[PDB]
Every structure is written in C-alpha cells, then in structure tokens.
Design a protein around this ligand. Structure first.
Ligand SMILES: *OP(=O)(O)OC[C@H]1O[C@@H](n2cnc3c(N)ncnc32)[C@H](O)[C@@H]1O
Length: 635
DNA sequence: GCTGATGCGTC
DNA sequence: GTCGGAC
DNA sequence: GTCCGACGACGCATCAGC
C-alpha cells in the first residue's frame, strides 16, 4: 500500500518484503530507485550508502529478481558491458533541447538556468501515463543508444520527452542526471558491488516465496557478521575483476548463489578483465619507503595506449582497452602479428602490453598524439599509416591456466620464455632489477631520453600477484613531472572563468589561461585549468576573481576557438601551472605560427600549483618560451 | 556532397 | 589523465 | 589507502545543417 513516494530504504530494521513499495512479482517502480538515490545523496559515509542501496537490492531480490540487473545498471549509470560499446549519443545540448520541449520553455532560458545551478536535473524537475518502472526506464535508455543514422537525434529527443512527461516527484531530476552522465551519487562500481554482495548474503536469492531467510546476519555477532560480509564481498569482487560483466554474473548469482559463483564465472581469454593500475609516487625515496624490504623491478613507462591481448584456444585474437572496450577491429596489424610473437607451444594467453606509435623508417617511438590519429575500425592492414610496436610487460593467462595468483617474478619468467621479440613490433618493456638509488635515478633519466614518461616500479615476490580485488593499484608510477623542480612549469594569466558543476556548483569550476605574445602584445589562450586547488583555494579564487568580471573581453585577449568563458576576467592574476608536456593544439592560439603555421600549443594534464603574486600579466610565460619548451620536447 | 559541432573514448 | 576530500 | 567525482587536451566517428 506504500506509495513509492514514501519509500525509505534508509530506515532501521529494513524488511525486504514489508518495507518495499511494490508487490511481489510487480515491476520495481523507478520512483523506488530515485528515492533510494535521494537517501544515498543525503549521507557522506560509504558504509551508510552501501547499506541503503543493499536494502533496495534485497527487496528486488526478494520480490522482482528480473529487475535486479536493470536496477544495478541504473545505479551505475551504465548501459551494459563495456565491450559491447553501447553509447547514448546524448549530450547536454541534446538534453536541454528535450527539457525545453518537454517544459514548454525556451532553449536559452533552460540553458542559462542549468549553467547557474550546475545541475540539469533540478531544471528538468522544477518545470496521464502509468508510473515509470526501473526496467522500463532502463529499456528506454537502451533504445536511445540504439538509435542511429540521419534524424536519429530527433528520435532520441522524443524518447527523452516521453520519459519526462511521465516523471513524478524526483524522477525527472535523476532521469536528466543519468542521461547527462552526472548522477553524482557518491557511490559507484566498488560500492555497488559491496551493496550487491551484502544484499544477496543477507537475503539469498532463489527461495520459495515468501522467503524464509530475509536477514541471514541476524543470528551472528556483529563481529562475525562483518567478517562474513567481507569474505562474501571478496568472492564477488575477485570474480568481477576477472569477469567485469554483470550480464554474465547476475544470472549465475541468482541461480547458484554467491558462494558458488567462482565455479561458474572465471578468467577466460575473450572476456576482458580489470587491469592492474598504478599509484603515483613523488620520488625514488617514496618508492623505497613504500616497498621497504621487498625486491622490485623498474620498467620504462611507455607513452602509448594499453592493449590487453587475448589469444583464444583455436586461434581467435581479441584486443581490449584499459576500460574493457573492444579494440579488435582497430588493430588488424597486431592480429596478423600474433603468430610471430608466441612460440608454437603457446595455445592461448592473455598479455598486458602498451601499444606505442612506431616510425619504421627511423626506428623510433612516436608521441602519443600520433598514435591517436589511427582509425577506430580499420579492415585492411594495408591502409594503416601509423604503425605500432607492442611493449609487453605482463602475462596474465597461459595455455589454459590463470596466472593471477602467481608473483610477478614468475609471470615475467613465463613471458620471457614463451614469447619472441621482434624489433619495432613486439618487445619486452625495458627493465632493471635493483635497489641501488643511483642506478634507479640513472635508469629514470634514461627512460625519458628514450621517449618515455618515467618508470613503473613493481614488486617481484612480495605482494606481487595480479589480484585486483586485493589491491587495484599495486604498481607504482614515477613520472618525470611528479618530481619537484622537474617538469614543465609555466606562469599563465587568468583570462576567463567557467561555472562549476556538481561539487563545484555555485563556484568557478575551471579557468581559461593565456600566455603572453610579446610580438603582438596580446594574451593568447593556451589551455583551461580545473584541478590542483584545494576547496579553500578554489573558494578564495571565486571571491577574488568575482571583482575582475567584465561584460566583454579586452581587445588584446585572443582565444580563437576555445570555449568562451562564462565570465571574462581582467588580465591580472598570474598562476603557476605544471603539466606533463606540451601538445600541438587544433584550437588554442598560443604560439600559433612559431612551431606550426596552423596550430598553436596547449598543455597536457595541466594542474594548479600556486598563485604568483609577484608577477603581472606582462611578465607571464611568453608564447616564444612556450614554443621553445615545445621544441626541446621533440629533439 | 561538404563542413563543423560534439559525443565519448584515449591519455 | 591529475587532483582533493571524507572515511 | 580506498573510493569517488570534480576538472584537463585531443582524436575519430557521427550527424545536423548547409
Ligand atoms: O598514469 P597511469 O596510472 O595511467 O599509468 C599506468 C599506465 O601506464 C602504461 N604503461 C606503460 N608502460 C608500462 C609498463 N612497462 N608497465 C605497466 N604499465 C605501463 C599502461 O598503459 C598503464 O595503464
């Protein structure tokens, strides 16, 4: 009898059946999800968020098992497994057109309001079909993403409008945020997985209705309960890190339970897995302090793109990105190369490599920017213009055996013994086994001279497995720009401000920076900036720059194609900014004509360091200096 | 038949 | 990709 | 240290507008 508007999955003593706002077998109302979202947004401790989400999931499992998968994807704001490549194709512009049409308002009015609040949901809401359902809403999202071709944008808009007109209470707020790609729950993959393992542990699936067991933790002590949930949570996590595909896991989970999940879902070539990531380290001394006694290896950190290469029993090859996207069609040249890299005894494998752009005439690595000019789907290897060289650094699976639980020392040994190097095509990452601080510093200096970002550091025997659920950032990355006094540092003028969104709402979220062109006495936009400040520094900058707002830009400020700032600023503040490198920009005018007739120069991964109170705009980094720095790069 | 805006992936 | 904040 | 969501440049692919 409970109207979903009153649904409260944050209550104490939540009963999956009696406290749900729908009847057994009935479709999960979307308003039940939105209310769950509200209660999750009301808190900042993940543990409380997880329990609240787990309560909804327990009711879904008890009452409407078929809706579990759509409710999960709604909670994650995803459309499906990443390797299927479903994409909404809906941005803010298209979303605001849908809001405008659905609210009888004008586009510019809706546009201004959304920019001020930094949230599209509030506008869409504050503006008879049957109640929306979770799977219903989820299905309409997938219909939107499957619309393709000419006039498809108008059809996507019709669907979005139909959703909004059926919205009630806070539904529209969350419809708009999901389509916007900014749900802002504070809860994502890891917390949703914890909520799921907690839900199916407390309220097991597959019981005869009404379920006899609704809270399997009641009979345990608080301590035993916590230990039990951590263990069950790890079972799900380690399975997910090997098979990050809910389409595969949920049917098994509902049919055989969590404790038997690894028997049915396990690492297999052809199914992407979560890759090992790296923790940034600010110097060699921090590396030694972090690994203390453990022996470790250093490897070049190549500046390319991650390629997880799967060879299946039978010969089929698949290649996946860091985010489990399917890149098989992008690398036909690599697929034809597989026979050359493996010994004939190798019948299957999963390799961890970096794909790097490679100049075959000069036999040299090329920058990342050249690698990105490859087409996303190339059918003919003969049409490839940017060759790649594979730098292999790990082996995760070999000849039917998962190596996830073996230490790096053995995974690397098997890689070196079972695979074959070919210059410019497939080689092992340059490496050095040492604990001598001078040798490491010399090795770091060489990696940069050899066209790399720095070093990867990895333990060989102690905590050296490939178990992402135990530690996802088990590796250390020591980049040149992490070091103090090293890396490109510039003093740039603040010429504009952009209204913040989400956590930055009611504030400036980013800024437009410029270098000083001496020859024309103009300030030339060079990049935007939006990270590196504390919340306090960012608030101070909102107040100090608010005074400098102008209705129109100064005549000596050139931005060309850059995003026009929401608020123009009188060139006064000069900020010190660090970046990983300089790039040739297709939009930014800074230093155009000094290194390239058509293109200016921008900053790769800029971040705020500190205000330079001792510098006026005329003494900022000059466009000539920017060009000089960029030339030092490509020597 | 072409061009520019832009979604969304890479880092 | 870099970064800061709450836990 | 984990987890999450603020924010960056830049490219191909796609599609609206012409
Ligand atoms: O900065 P980040 O955390 O994305 O760095 C990790 C990425 O670095 C790339 N990479 C390049 N070379 C290596 C080696 N030798 N070992 C491990 N990772 C490496 C990868 O693309 C990785 O995701």
């Amino acid at each position: 009898d409970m109207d979903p508007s009153g649904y409260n999955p944050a209550k104490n003593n939540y009963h999956p059946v009696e406290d749900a706002c729908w009847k057994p077998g009935q479709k999960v109302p979307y308003l039940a999800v939105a209310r769950t979202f509200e209660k999750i947004e009301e808190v900042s401790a993940r543990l409380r968020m997880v329990e609240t989400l787990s309560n909804l999931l327990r009711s879904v499992v008890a009452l409407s098992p078929p809706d579990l998968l759509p409710v999960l994807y709604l909670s994650l704001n995803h459309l499906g497994p990443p390797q299927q490549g479903l994409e909404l194709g809906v941005g803010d512009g298209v979303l605001l057109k849908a809001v405008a049409q659905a609210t009888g308002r004008q586009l510019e009015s809706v546009r201004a309001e959304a920019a001020e609040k930094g949230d599209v949901g509030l506008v869409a809401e504050n503006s008879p079909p049957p109640p929306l359902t979770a799977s219903g809403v989820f299905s309409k999202f997938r219909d939107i993403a499957r619309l393709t071709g000419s006039a498809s944008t108008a059809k996507k808009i019709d669907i979005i409008k139909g959703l909004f007109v059926a919205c009630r209470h806070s539904e529209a707020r969350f419809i708009a945020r999901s389509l916007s790609g900014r749900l802002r729950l504070g809860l994502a993959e890891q917390s949703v997985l914890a909520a799921l393992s907690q839900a199916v542990s407390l309220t097991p699936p597959g019981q005869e209705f009404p379920p006899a067991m609704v809270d399997a933790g009641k009979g345990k002590t608080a301590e035993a309960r916590k230990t039990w949930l951590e263990e069950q949570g790890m079972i799900l996590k380690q399975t997910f890190c090997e098979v990050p595909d809910l389409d595969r896991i949920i049917p098994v989970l509902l049919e055989h339970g969590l404790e038997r999940l690894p028997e049915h879902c396990k690492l297999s070539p052809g199914i992407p897995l979560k890759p090992m990531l790296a923790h940034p380290t600010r110097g060699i001394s921090e590396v030694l302090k972090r690994f203390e006694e453990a022996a470790f290896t250093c490897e070049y950190k190549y500046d390319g793109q991650r390629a997880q290469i799967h060879a299946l029993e039978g010969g089929e090859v698949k290649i996946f990105s860091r985010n489990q996207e399917d890149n098989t069609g992008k690398y036909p040249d690599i697929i034809s190369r597989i026979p050359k890299i493996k010994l004939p005894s190798v019948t299957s494998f999963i390799l961890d490599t970096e794909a790097v752009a490679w100049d075959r005439e000069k036999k040299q690595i090329q920058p990342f920017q050249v690698l990105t000019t490859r087409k996303r789907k190339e059918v003919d290897a003969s049409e490839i213009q940017v060759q790649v060289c594979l730098y292999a650094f790990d082996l995760i699976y070999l000849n039917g055996e998962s190596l996830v639980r073996e230490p790096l020392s053995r995974r690397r040994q098997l890689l070196r013994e079972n695979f074959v190097e070919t210059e410019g095509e497939f080689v092992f990452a340059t490496s050095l086994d040492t604990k001598d601080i001078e040798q490491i510093a010399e090795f770091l200096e060489q990696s940069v001279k050899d066209s790399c970002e720095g070093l990867m550091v990895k333990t060989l025997d102690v905590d050296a497995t490939y178990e992402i659920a135990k530690r996802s950032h088990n590796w250390l990355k020591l980049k040149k720009d992490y070091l103090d006094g090293v890396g490109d540092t510039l003093d740039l003028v603040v010429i504009g401000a952009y209204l913040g969104r989400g956590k930055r709402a009611g504030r400036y979220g980013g800024f437009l920076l410029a270098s000083y062109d001496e020859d024309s006495e103009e300030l030339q936009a060079i990049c935007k900036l939006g990270t590196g400040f504390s919340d306090e520094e960012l608030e101070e900058h909102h107040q100090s720059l608010k005074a400098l707002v102008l209705p129109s830009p100064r005549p000596y400020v050139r931005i060309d194609g850059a995003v026009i700032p929401d608020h123009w600023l009188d060139p006064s503040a000069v900020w010190e900014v660090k970046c990983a490198d300089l790039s040739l920009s297709p939009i930014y005018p800074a230093a155009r004509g000094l290194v390239d007739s058509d293109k200016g120069i921008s900053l790769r991964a800029p971040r705020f360091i500190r205000v330079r109170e001792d510098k006026q705009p005329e003494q900022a980094t000059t466009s000539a200096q920017v060009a000089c720095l960029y030339r030092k790069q490509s020597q």
